[PDB]
Amino acid sequence: FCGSMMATGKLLVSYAPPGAEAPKSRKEAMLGTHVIWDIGLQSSCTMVVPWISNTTYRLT
């Protein structure tokens, strides 16, 4: 986050595994994996998208 130090806010970063309709609002994205990011507290947020797949490898 590259705003002024006087800026505050909370964001949600979501990863949804495939199969369903891609999330269109926060109500849906919140049902998958997600992290809440306090930009006023941390300038950087890190989310790990864990490996979840039917196959052992995904095509590039």
Added chain:
Amino acid sequence: GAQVSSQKVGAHEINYTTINYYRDSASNAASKDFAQDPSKFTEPVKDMQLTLGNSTITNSVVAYGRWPEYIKDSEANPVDQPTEPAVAACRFYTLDTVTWRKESRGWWWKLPDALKDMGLFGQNMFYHYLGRAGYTVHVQCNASKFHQGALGVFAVPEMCLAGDSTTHMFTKYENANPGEKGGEFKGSFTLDTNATNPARNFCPVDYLFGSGVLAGNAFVYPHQIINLRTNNCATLVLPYVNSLSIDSMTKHNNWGIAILPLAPLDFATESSTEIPITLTIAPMCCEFNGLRNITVPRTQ
């Protein structure tokens, strides 16, 4: 089998004998600094990053100092196998964000009512006759260093709210269980006089805390203050509280969440200022019993 106990002598000029004559003990007579004697009643803190299921959150009270826990085999009333969804249901769900203005009188929600339409937790709740769960409630409200205002977040066991009519206990099921939208406190009591089509809704007066008690004493309940100059959020860890080890989640709401503006919101010199408040609730130690066809309660 005489019991010889000691008296506490006051005015001096020392043992008294008591014998129980009845088989039933109910027939017996009664036998009789900053440190808080009831440490558990003064909103003890969890003394970061809270991860539940696939959800993560980055000022935390444990209600009554009791962490959520599963039913002990010693205190299990039902005999059928308990369903424990685990990470499927025990995860953080984010309710609809509300708007805090200079004129807001407060907001309220019921648990487990507010999570009845939340993923697999709602499915398990409506598929089972009995359900039990604690909660982690995370209230989020951020504002600049030039904003001022304070919110009191209270977790009330058996949060019963007063009605709006001369008829006692007349609030209908639909209005008493609004879901994730919850309801709002009011600054005054307005009597519903529509005898033809009564609203049958609550009329929670803020300074009466919606139940005929002064709001100033609501701090006896588990609570946390979000003071905008100090902190952004508030975490409340609520254990399962009830007169039973497990009950019906559709019939009974175990907890109520109340957010009241203790200090009104204000900013610079803009009379038009509003900041969102976002609630994120994760049920904890969920367990359900009595699987059958799904319940579909009446709406509107």
Added chain:
Amino acid sequence: GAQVSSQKVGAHEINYTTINYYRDSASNAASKDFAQDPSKFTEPVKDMQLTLGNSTITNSVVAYGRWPEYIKDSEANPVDQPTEPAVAACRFYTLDTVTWRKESRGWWWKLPDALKDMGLFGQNMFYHYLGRAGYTVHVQCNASKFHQGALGVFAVPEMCLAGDSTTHMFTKYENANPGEKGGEFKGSFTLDTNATNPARNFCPVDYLFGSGVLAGNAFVYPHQIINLRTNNCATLVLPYVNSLSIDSMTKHNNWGIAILPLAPLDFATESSTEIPITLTIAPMCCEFNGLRNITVPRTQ
């Protein structure tokens, strides 16, 4: 590092040496009574009352002699925590009863497709990206001692059924996943010539077992015979079978159930005779991964 192996001499007038020259082993050359040598391929029995969850059932084959089991930590591809509903999903669900007549050509179902709308199992299936489960399939068909007829019940891994058009692999998702109603085999192949609004459905011919193979050889699959003079029911215990430890339940059907009349139904001298067949399937050792919003596949 020479390998000296022994030859098996035939015509006599005895060791041969082999050395691997490449680092990759794929470069290596190939090294080379009633008792059934493949005991597991001859439909081994469970050698009463089957209770799963809150369901009880009062002639049982274990497919490939492999009981259903949970994923070993050694063979877990996904890294997120697995949801195991347990008794909530692992219970007997009864599908719609079908009618066996003198003219029936057979019935088929797909698993997990047939249980997609079955209580909490369907909810878990549609809420998760990955799912895995074995099954216990109980086919029930009772008739008097004066009825005659035989049914062959086959559990086929990767039961792919032929289409009904000149276009290859043209059966659409909706027709390939009918749910608990399943589908019926046909006595002959009828080509769909409606190029404007093609049915895009299967045309499973009974004597071709719906896949271009002679039905007589379907007994190589796990199977059980319900001979009306002998037994009422058939139990098939199917382990999870796939090229992967866990897959998508909405995309892929791991098993197919086929019921074919091996001997036609007959009774006394009434040409009009019909007896019901009831399927009861309990998923076993269910585990799901990848929780997100619920999947809602297209229908009709």
